[PDB]
Amino acid sequence: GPEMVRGQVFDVGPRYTNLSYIGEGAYGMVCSAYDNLNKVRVAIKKISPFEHQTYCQRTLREIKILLRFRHENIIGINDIIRAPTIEQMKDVYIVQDLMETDLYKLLKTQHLSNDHICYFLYQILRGLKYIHSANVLHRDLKPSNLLLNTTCDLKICDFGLARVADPDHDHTGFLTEYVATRWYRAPEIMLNSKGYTKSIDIWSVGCILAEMLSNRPIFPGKHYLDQLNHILGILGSPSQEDLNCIINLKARNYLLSLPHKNKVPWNRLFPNADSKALDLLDKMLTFNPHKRIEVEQALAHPYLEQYYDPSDEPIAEAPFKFDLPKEKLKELIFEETARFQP
Ligand SMILES: Nc1nnnn1NCc1cccc(OCc2ccccc2)c1
């Protein structure tokens, strides 16, 4: 029969042998395995998404994006295993490079040197430059979505919430629900934005940088609106100029109802930090999204001077472009995964 793991079938042979459990998840099970072809250990995730239209959609979205991206700092798909017919296809197995750890697990346990912080940040921005150049927003950047191997190469993963940028359709009402991870949400999400512009990823990168400096999340809101008050407590009350950019009255009047708060200077929160890192942090964590630095300007910042090399920071060859019943989604997943057969 097929090899089994923790009371579940993991039908990936013959190429992939000698499995070990390494993780459950709400999306499915991850095992490591021996690739008998390349003679390396890989990671394999088993997904069973076809009973739910929502999992089908996220699965298909991420497959199409990762198959089209090719970049050293973005996780790739090595292989996809599934049944030879649509009728027999109940599960899909995705094969990726095995990564040692992620930035979330690293920060819980390790102090980072300024050299590591700088190198990690450079790789995040280098990968983000390629992503944005393709007109895609990640929208859920956080430490657990940044994987690392044993030599500190970093790869961005988890494109399940990614969208094509759509700035003309970004506006929305006060307190509109959002799905990405609370601590790393840009303030405009809670006020007037659907998160369809590149500036929301830069905010999340600024949060990750702050978290690398201190080993703890800088804005750990308990709930939707607590998140905003954590932000203003450090950045201070927005200026009149920045309020004038918020035209929705509910959002503007909420901010006007709050007590005045002054900015807390970064160097008081992070006394050990490199002052160039704090200058870049300041420009990433700007309240007003139109004043927030873009990814190419961040790469050119003096903090990153020993790595910056635009001729070695590739952009995508063409911008990326894409209500369906699950039956059609299943058919679409079948079609996209065909190139890995037999
Ligand atoms: N790559 C890696 N190393 N350790 N863990 N880990 N990855 C989590 C993971 C492993 C293997 C395949 C994975 O892919 C999930 C995915 C789901 C849907 C579409 C495309 C890919 C994820």
> How far is residue 282's CA from residue 93's CA, in Å, rounded to a whole number?
42
- Where, residue-wise, is CATH 1.10.510.10 in the chain? 99-323
Structural contact between residues 35 and 41, judged by C-beta atoms closer than 8 angstroms: yes
Burial class (CB in 10 A: 0-12, 13-18, 19+), 329: buried
To which H or E segment does residue 114 belong? Answer: helix 114-133
The structure was resolved to a resolution in Å of: 2.0
Structural contact between residues 186 and 203, judged by C-beta atoms closer than 8 angstroms: yes
Take residue 290 and report the two structure tokens written for it: 């139109």
Residue that is written with structure tokens 């700035």 in the block: 167
- Looking at domain 1-98+324-342, its CATH class is alpha beta
> How far is residue 65's CA from residue 85's CA, in Å, rounded to a whole number?
23
Take residue 3 and report the two structure tokens written for it: 């090899």
Q: What is the CA radius of gyration of the chain?
A: 21
User: What values do phi and psi take at 19, rounded to 5?
Assistant: -80, 155
> How far is residue 262's CA from residue 65's CA, in Å, rounded to a whole number?
42
Residue of 189, 134, 45, 116 whose CA lies nearest to 315: 134
In this structure, the chain runs to a length of: 342
SS3 209: helix
The CATH number corresponding to 99-323 among 1.10.510.10, 3.40.50.300, 1.10.3720.10, 2.60.40.150 equals 1.10.510.10
Residue that is written with structure tokens 């200058």 in the block: 279
Residue of 170, 96, 98, 182 whose CA lies nearest to 140: 182
Take residue 335 and report the two structure tokens written for it: 């079609």
Contacts of 175 (CB under 8 A, 6+ apart): 190, 224, 225, 250
* Nearest CA, atom 5, ligand 1: 99
115 tagged catalytic: no
Burial class (CB in 10 A: 0-12, 13-18, 19+), 47: buried
Distance 190 CA to ligand 1 centre (A): 30
- Where, residue-wise, is CATH 3.30.200.20 in the chain? 1-98+324-342
Of the residues 41, 157, 329, which should be mutated to test ligand 1's pocket, given the most ligand atoms within 8 Å of the CB?
157
Structural contact between residues 46 and 93, judged by C-beta atoms closer than 8 angstroms: yes
Within 10 Å of residue 241's Cβ, how many Cβ atoms?
A: 9
Residue 74, strand partner residues: 156
Distances (CA, A) of 197 to 35, 80, 203: 40, 31, 11
Of the residues 40, 45, 81, which should be mutated to test ligand 1's pocket, given the most ligand atoms within 8 Å of the CB?
45
Q: Tell me if 45 is assigned to a ligand binding site.
A: yes
